């Protein structure tokens, strides 16, 4: 029986299946960050200063 355990707890296979999981893990997590890529568009297309008037009129109204 030690032979039959050692056939299938073989360290040749333990190390394979552990390395494979790690690659898929970093593949998926980075594929989540490019799934949140759109902040770069939002921060770019809207840069609108003018509302500092809208602030300052509220701010003098608050003041």
């Amino acid at each position: 029986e030690l032979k039959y355990i050692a056939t299938e707890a073989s360290p040749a296979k333990v190390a394979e299946i552990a390395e494979d999981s790690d690659v898929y893990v970093s593949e998926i997590e980075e594929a989540a960050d490019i799934l949140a890529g759109d902040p770069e568009i939002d921060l770019g297309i809207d840069v609108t200063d003018e509302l500092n008037q809208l602030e300052t009129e509220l701010l003098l109204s608050q003041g």
Binding site: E1, L2, I5, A6, E8, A9, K13, V14, I17, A18, D20, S21, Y24
Partner: protein
């Protein structure tokens, strides 16, 4: 029957221990005869009882070490068997 396989080993441990009782008794019996034969002045026979006396002690030690060796080898199947299954769920995670 791998359970019965580990059962069987644990069974034989009791036989090995049983005999170790038996020869322990005979060891002292031989030593008693030696003590008598010295008082007989039959010191030839006396040291012969002593020779047969210590003839058992090695055989008891022979048993004890064989027992310890098999207890250790059971444990390697206990620990080993759980490791094997751990490997298969990590294979399930991978796939």
């Amino acid at each position: 029957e791998k359970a019965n396989l580990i059962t069987n080993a644990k069974v034989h441990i009791h036989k090995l221990n049983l005999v170790n009782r038996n020869y322990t008794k005979r060891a002292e019996i031989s030593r008693k005869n030696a003590k008598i034969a010295l008082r007989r002045g039959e010191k030839t026979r006396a040291k012969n009882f002593l020779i047969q006396y210590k003839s058992y002690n090695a055989k008891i030690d022979r048993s004890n070490n064989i027992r310890s060796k098999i207890e250790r080898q059971i444990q390697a199947i206990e620990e080993g068997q759980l490791i094997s299954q751990t490997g298969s769920i990590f294979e399930g995670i991978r796939d």
